[PDB]
Design a protein around this ligand. Sequence first.
Ligand code: HEM
Ligand SMILES: COc1cccc(CO)c1O
Length: 403
Amino acid sequence: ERPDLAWLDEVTMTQLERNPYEVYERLRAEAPLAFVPVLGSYVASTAEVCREVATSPDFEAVITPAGGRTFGHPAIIGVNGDIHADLRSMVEPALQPAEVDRWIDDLVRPIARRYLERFENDGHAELVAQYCEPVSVRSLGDLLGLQEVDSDKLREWFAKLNRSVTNAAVDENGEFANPEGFAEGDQAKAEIRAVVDPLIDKWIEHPDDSAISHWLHDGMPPGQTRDREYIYPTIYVYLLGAMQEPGHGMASTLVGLFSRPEQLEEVVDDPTLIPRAIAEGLRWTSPIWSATARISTKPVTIAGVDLPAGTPVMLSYGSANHDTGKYEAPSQYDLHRPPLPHLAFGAGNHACAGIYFANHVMRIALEELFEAIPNLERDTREGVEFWGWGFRGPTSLHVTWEV
Ligand code: HEM
Ligand SMILES: COc1cccc(CO)c1O
């Protein structure tokens, strides 16, 4: 429709998944709010527009089309009003900073050690599969009450949900171009139900300290629980993003550090710099790159575009975090970048609920890794490929060290 952006008609889903940064560099200059045909939606690409939409009184949450097809209702990310308030009150207790501080070290550090012990003497490893993902899912899985679900299984589930939720491509008529791509999301949900339904059966009668048990019981009248159909979509939200993203963030941080060997040495020497390293890692390759959205509730003008009521806008926070209006040479990882606001945790009433927890998981994981393997080196025989438009991170991270 917009004539000067006719080139967007030729952007493909595969291109965006392999590397979205060239398209979005053009969008940030040409059209900070732009309709992207293959995505079937307006996309916000700059920090100013993403923050405005995410915080505007004239927008509310909406799930992406493929997200809705996968998760259904009421996913915490796609609802508003009283239901959203209830789901936030449901998830927030275990994520409160004073609560996290009571137990985060005893949760994550033994897990990180357990996975590290399996390879720390090998001289080689693929850190995504052998460390970053397992620590992320085992930590959250235990908190949730999924101790008996193997980390291999939790990792398979968030891979399948990832592909289903980001199966966004639409055809000439605005219909999903790849409908068969939702089948593995449906199969993941069926497997999750088979595992989690018995656990919920038990928690209803025998509550414990698991987070899901508290989701069922907290704030409810005596003898009542939240219906499982009311909480399952948020369970799925967790089994995707909350399981995947801390692993993504640690891995991207390491890749960035490896790209700046002088900076990797600083952080290994001085582990108090790990939080700063992680913050730059999240800006540099945002794990949740473009997975959430808002919808206008009345006619509104954003970045010169007159939007009718009912218009969805995807928030490409990963692009916003490369806004050259804010950052110098944003495509380069720089630990010594001045600490500035970023949008990797979103903004507004639907901003990330688990920031404090996530930052500690990533921190502890990197602390233990650098303690166990101070001479870590990237395996330069294998390149690092990043994949993902909706969620983005490295597909593998081959490293070596002198044993
Ligand atoms: C580095 C790791 C993580 C990153 C980068 C991340 C980022 C985000 C982003 C971008 C959103 C959408 C915000 C928006 O639409 O404005 C979000 C939502 C959310 N995240 Fe995080 N997340 C991470 C880890 C986690 C973890 C571990 C948990 C739970 C233990 C969690 C819980 C949630 C919840 C519940 C929401 C939905 C909030 C709502 O819609 O009201 N996140 N996250
Ligand atoms: C915490 O998990 C998520 C956060 C934001 C988006 C999604 C899925 O679109 C998630 O699963």
